[PDB]
């Protein structure tokens, strides 16, 4: 819709980019918590480059 | 109007806004690109 | 119903964006933990492809 | 009855709504969740069709 | 009246209401049949 | 009785339309919550039609 | 009236109320005999 | 005592209605829920008429 | 009186509550004559 | 005493009827559970009448 | 006096107290006599 | 002490009937509790008259 | 005095007072009279 | 001390009253439980007279 | 004084709380006297 | 009218949610055939 | 000192009767409890004299 | 002085306190007399 | 120093008598539970003089 | 002065309050020496 | 984009400074916490240099 | 504008915000770099 | 400092006062708890000087 | 940057101070513990120098 | 800073000294907790010098 | 200044602190040689 | 401006803070190295 | 400025301050040698 930027007059821009900004730092810490907590995707418990310890 | 932006206030917030989440999703597209080669998951 | 537009004359378009934006990115999160619950679509550990860990 | 129209002189329209919207959508996740809990109508856990993990 | 909604208000809201009802009604009553066809439960 | 009408010159007709209401919606939960607690009357689980998991 | 409504509301009210009641009286009377038809419980 | 009803001038007709409507619905759920509480009186796990699951 | 309520609003009101209680009463006798053609208790 | 009905200038008739009957009826309600608690006085768990279930 | 009842009322109630008193403690010892013949407990 | 009437004038006599009930009504539920958690005065529990369950 | 009421009705209040307690005194007593006819705890 | 009476000139009469009342209550029950805590001081649960239980 | 009492009200409630006081020690003192005679503790 | 809103407001807010909407449930349709595709479910 | 008694110009005699009478009672509650959870100075459970239960 | 009791009030009050703990304590003396007389505990 | 009077010209006797009458009769409290929780110093425990019990 | 007090007063109350901490002291001596004689700790 | 100075315009510089100074310190905590609890990247307990205890 | 800055207030500080930012994003990366020669994690 | 009495401007002597006296109490407490909860300086179970009990 | 001082027009200089030191300290006691809890640099536990009790 | 001086003109100087003081007694205390929670540096079990119970 | 004191009362508060510091300090110290000479620690 | 400071203020606050800064870095750099020759982390 | 004090007071209570601090960092450096001769940790 070209008349999109109309949302601004609704809703404020400083909330919703204050919003924007927390909501997508919380979603990549939780997306890097779920693919730690799996065995194939925790780049640090993987062994590759292969193990010192 | 109700966030008592003026229309041309609102229009110019959004070019930015809408600039700023393209570069954005450029920057996280590349960073899923190299996920992928990385290790695919599907 | 061509007057269903009327209904933004009753429930404010503001607070029914800010609760469909909240809601579906709720059900987003939600739909996507109970696949990751379930063996058959939890795609980071269903082993395809191929496992390296 | 006929004048069935007059309830919404007696319960606020809005608040029906908002009220009515809310219990479909809660209704509907007990439901699918009921539905999840259970082995015959588990859709996710069926094994149908065959299973890849 | 007591809503403060005036009486062609409150049959025009009641007239868009229930279609509404009777269309979600409708998509409820074909997924019940798509899901009968699927997997009955009786 | 034939005054049974005044009633609603006592209790608020749109009080006694909510809680009407809600109380029937909590007690049908309440009904289908204790069918499915039960073996003989848990249309789900019951295996009728014929199992497919 | 404690309620604030007229003797011509309440009747009118009561006459919509208990038509309405004996509507839902009636579907669940028919979901009923189908509950019995399909298992009864006594 | 014919003139029992003075009673109303004394206690709120409304309060005293929403009352007892209100224990009479919480008795009943309470007998329903000791009946099938026990073996005897559990309508739905007495196994009569004979069982299906 | 400490009701608020007139004498005559009093009567009418207990004459009311007095019928609907004796009917709410039958029912009650029905379903309990029920009850025990179906499982005495004692 | 003859002036035994001067304690109503005393204690106001309403408090004390509402007391009274609340009073009872969880009187009545906590001898009924006492009586269903033991063995000897659970006409529910009796097995007189010679049970069915 | 404290309460605000007049003597004559306060005479009043205290007799219709009395007489649903005296009629709710028949109602209880015929229910009483009739557990005695079901089972007595001493 | 024959002036032992004078206590009303200094503790308020609704009060003192209000205690003195609640207090009694207490004190008999407790006692009949204390003889019903014993083997000897548990009149429901104690096998007299002969038991017919 | 500190109370609101009279020496008159402080002494009419004691005297309906020790009555009633008086009367359930006497019921007490002739219940625990039954009481150790019954099963006697010393 | 012949002017003891001046006490209730310092502590309120009414209070102290009611204070002493409540104090002995709960020592005569305390003292109570206290014996029927000890096997030697229950005349309950002695066995005198001689038990039906 | 601190508690609004006269020193006359003071004296005659002083006596009245000590003779109240005296029966009960000596309602105490019988019921102790049974007590021992019933079971001694020392 | 109770939200502040005029007609031609409601119209065009009307008109710019539904397009917004259909897009949105355009995307979400490509992302589950995608998903068939991957691992169909039924 | 002789001028002992001016410490009631300094704290309050009413406040202190309160305090004094409440720890005396307090204290003797617990000398007892404390006599009674030793064995050798419980006088109800000592044996002495000899035990009829 | 902050207690608001004059010099003599307080004269006096000092002499009946004193006077009701020495007896206090003679009766505590007395019993425990009697306490070490039936068991001494050092 | 010859001039600890002055300190009352800033701690304020009345709070500090009590203050310091509570927090002795804490300490005696605390310093009998001490040596009562000891084997050496229970002077009720001790065994001495010779028990009864 | 901070406390209200004057000079005087401080002065007469520091006295007293010497001479009865001086006597507390002297008492809790004695229960020491007594303590010590019946079992010493040290 | 060039007008990305006019942010400032609407968040406020010190609440953004602020918010930025925390979460850049709880994330650093974070992933230092995260890195020690694995094995591979617990540089105090790999035993790299070779250990003395 | 809504913060109570100036244009130019907002152009200097965003330098100057840009300026540290890009210091810090340097000192990160040297860490990083090291980090990667010390052990590499991917 | 020859100037450290002019600390007493600064802070209030009857405030530090009472926080140096209390601070006092409450470290002799736990340096004697502390002392009693170890085997070498408990003096009280120390078995110096020789037993009884 | 040259006009970095301008940072205290926004952000108070004694709230930073404050924030700053009460940060640092915890962030110091904070890695002194994080060592202590490791056995490769717990110097109170190493045994270095050679150990005496 | 010869000017660091004027760092009394931002921070308050009473509450300085406060927080210094009881940060310092606070830190004292963990650090002498910490030293006896080891064996290495509890001086009151070291057994040095040799003990006596 | 702050605390409302004097120079002269500060100086004199001083002194007597730092006087009834020096008698607790070597009350303290001949405690802590006495508890040397009972048992040394160290 | 926004916290109340003149300009020049900010910047000797600035300087003080940095200096400081630097100093308490430089401890810490020494105690680092002496951290290092005592027991290497790398 | 700030606390209200002037830059005289500022100073004064500067030098006095860093004189304690330093006394107290003498106390504490002792403290600390008398430790390392006792019982080294490093
Ligand atoms: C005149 O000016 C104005 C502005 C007012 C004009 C505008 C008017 C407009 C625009 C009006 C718009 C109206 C709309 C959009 C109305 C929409 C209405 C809808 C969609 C109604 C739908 C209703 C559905 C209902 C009430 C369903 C109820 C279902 C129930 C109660 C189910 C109960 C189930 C139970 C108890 C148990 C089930 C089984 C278990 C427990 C297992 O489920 C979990
Ligand atoms: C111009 O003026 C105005 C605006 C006022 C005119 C307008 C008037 C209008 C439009 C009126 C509209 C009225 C309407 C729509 C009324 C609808 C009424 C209905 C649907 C009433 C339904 C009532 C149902 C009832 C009360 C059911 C009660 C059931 C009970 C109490 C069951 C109890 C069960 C128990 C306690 C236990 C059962 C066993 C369990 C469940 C526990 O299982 C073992
Ligand atoms: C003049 O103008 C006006 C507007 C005022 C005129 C209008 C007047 C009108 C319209 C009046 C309407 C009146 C109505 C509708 C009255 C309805 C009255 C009813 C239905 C009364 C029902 C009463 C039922 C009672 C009191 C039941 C009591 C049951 C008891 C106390 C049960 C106790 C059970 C116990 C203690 C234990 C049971 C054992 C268990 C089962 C719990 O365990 C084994
Ligand atoms: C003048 O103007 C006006 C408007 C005021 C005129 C109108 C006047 C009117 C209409 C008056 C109406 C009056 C009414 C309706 C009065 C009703 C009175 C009733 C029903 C009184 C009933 C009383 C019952 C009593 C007090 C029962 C007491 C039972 C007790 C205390 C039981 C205790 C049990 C114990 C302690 C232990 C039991 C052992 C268990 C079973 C708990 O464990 C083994
Ligand atoms: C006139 O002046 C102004 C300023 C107002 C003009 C400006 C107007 C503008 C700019 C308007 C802009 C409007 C916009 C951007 C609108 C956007 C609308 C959108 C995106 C709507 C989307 C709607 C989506 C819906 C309603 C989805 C509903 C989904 C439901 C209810 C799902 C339910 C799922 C259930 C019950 C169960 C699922 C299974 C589970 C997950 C439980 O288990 C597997
Ligand atoms: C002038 O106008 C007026 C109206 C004021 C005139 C009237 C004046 C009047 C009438 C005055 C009346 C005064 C009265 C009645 C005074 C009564 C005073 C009494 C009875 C005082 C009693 C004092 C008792 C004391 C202080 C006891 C203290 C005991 C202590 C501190 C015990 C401590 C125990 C410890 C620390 C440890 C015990 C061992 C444990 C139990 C812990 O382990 C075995
Ligand atoms: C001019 O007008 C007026 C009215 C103002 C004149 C009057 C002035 C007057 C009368 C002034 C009176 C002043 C007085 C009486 C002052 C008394 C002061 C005293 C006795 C001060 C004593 C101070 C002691 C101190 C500060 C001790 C500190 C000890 C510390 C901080 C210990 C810390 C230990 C730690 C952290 C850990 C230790 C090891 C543990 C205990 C944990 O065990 C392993
Ligand atoms: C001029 O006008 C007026 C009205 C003001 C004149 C009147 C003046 C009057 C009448 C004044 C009266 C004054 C009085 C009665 C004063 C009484 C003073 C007393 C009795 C003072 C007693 C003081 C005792 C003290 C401060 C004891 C302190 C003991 C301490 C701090 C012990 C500490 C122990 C520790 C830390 C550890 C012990 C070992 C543990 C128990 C922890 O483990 C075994
Ligand atoms: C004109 O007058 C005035 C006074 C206004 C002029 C003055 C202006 C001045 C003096 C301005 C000063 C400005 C300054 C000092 C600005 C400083 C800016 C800085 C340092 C900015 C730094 C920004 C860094 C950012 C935003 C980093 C973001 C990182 C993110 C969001 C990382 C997310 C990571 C996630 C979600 C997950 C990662 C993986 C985990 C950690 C979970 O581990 C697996
Ligand atoms: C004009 O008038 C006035 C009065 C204003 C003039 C006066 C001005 C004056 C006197 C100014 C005085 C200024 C002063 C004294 C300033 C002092 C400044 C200091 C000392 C600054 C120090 C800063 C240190 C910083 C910012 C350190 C930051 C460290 C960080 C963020 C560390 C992070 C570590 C992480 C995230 C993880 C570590 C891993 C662990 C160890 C936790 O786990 C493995
Ligand atoms: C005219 O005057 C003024 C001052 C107004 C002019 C100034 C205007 C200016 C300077 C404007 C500046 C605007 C800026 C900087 C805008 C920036 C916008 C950005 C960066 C937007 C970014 C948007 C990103 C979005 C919307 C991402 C959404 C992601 C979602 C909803 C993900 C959901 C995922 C779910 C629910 C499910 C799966 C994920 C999980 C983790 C569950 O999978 C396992
Ligand atoms: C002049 O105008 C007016 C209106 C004032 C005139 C009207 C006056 C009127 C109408 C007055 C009416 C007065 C009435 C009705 C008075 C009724 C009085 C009654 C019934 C008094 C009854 C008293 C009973 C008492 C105080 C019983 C006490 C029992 C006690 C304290 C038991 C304690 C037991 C203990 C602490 C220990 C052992 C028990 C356990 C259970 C623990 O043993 C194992
Ligand atoms: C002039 O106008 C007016 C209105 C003021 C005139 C009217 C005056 C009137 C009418 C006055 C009436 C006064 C009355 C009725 C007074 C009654 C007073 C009574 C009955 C007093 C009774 C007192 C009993 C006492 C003080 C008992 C105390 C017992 C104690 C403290 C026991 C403590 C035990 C302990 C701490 C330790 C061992 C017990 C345990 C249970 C622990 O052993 C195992
Ligand atoms: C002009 O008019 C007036 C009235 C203003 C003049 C008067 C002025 C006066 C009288 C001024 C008086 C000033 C005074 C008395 C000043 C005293 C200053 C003192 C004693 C300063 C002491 C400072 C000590 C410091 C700052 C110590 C800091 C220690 C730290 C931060 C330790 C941190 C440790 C960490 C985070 C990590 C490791 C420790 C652990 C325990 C974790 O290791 C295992
Ligand atoms: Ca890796
Ligand atoms: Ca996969
Ligand atoms: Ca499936
Ligand atoms: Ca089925
Ligand atoms: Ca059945
Ligand atoms: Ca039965
Ligand atoms: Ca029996
Ligand atoms: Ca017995
Ligand atoms: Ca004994
Ligand atoms: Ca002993
Ligand atoms: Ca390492
Ligand atoms: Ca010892
Ligand atoms: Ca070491
Ligand atoms: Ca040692």
């Given at each position: 819709?070209p008349?999109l930027?109309?949302?601004?007059?609704?809703?404020?821009?400083?909330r919703?980019?204050?919003?924007?900004?927390?909501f997508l730092?919380?979603?990549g810490?939780?997306?890097?918590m779920?693919?730690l907590?799996?065995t194939?995707?925790n780049?640090?418990?993987?062994?590759?480059?292969?193990?010192?310890? | 109007?109700?966030?008592?932006?003026?229309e041309?206030?609102a229009?110019?917030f959004?070019?930015?806004?809408?600039?700023?989440?393209?570069?954005?999703?450029?920057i996280?597209?590349?960073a899923?690109?190299?996920?992928?080669?990385?290790?695919?998951?599907?």
């Amino acid at each position: 819709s070209p008349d999109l930027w109309k949302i601004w007059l609704l809703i404020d821009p400083r909330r919703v980019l204050i919003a924007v900004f927390a909501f997508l730092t919380i979603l990549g810490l939780a997306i890097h918590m779920i693919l730690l907590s799996t065995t194939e995707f925790n780049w640090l418990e993987d062994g590759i480059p292969a193990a010192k310890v | 109007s109700m966030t008592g932006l003026t229309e041309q206030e609102a229009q110019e917030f959004h070019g930015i806004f809408v600039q700023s989440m393209t570069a954005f999703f450029g920057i996280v597209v590349i960073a899923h690109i190299l996920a992928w080669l990385w290790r695919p998951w599907l």
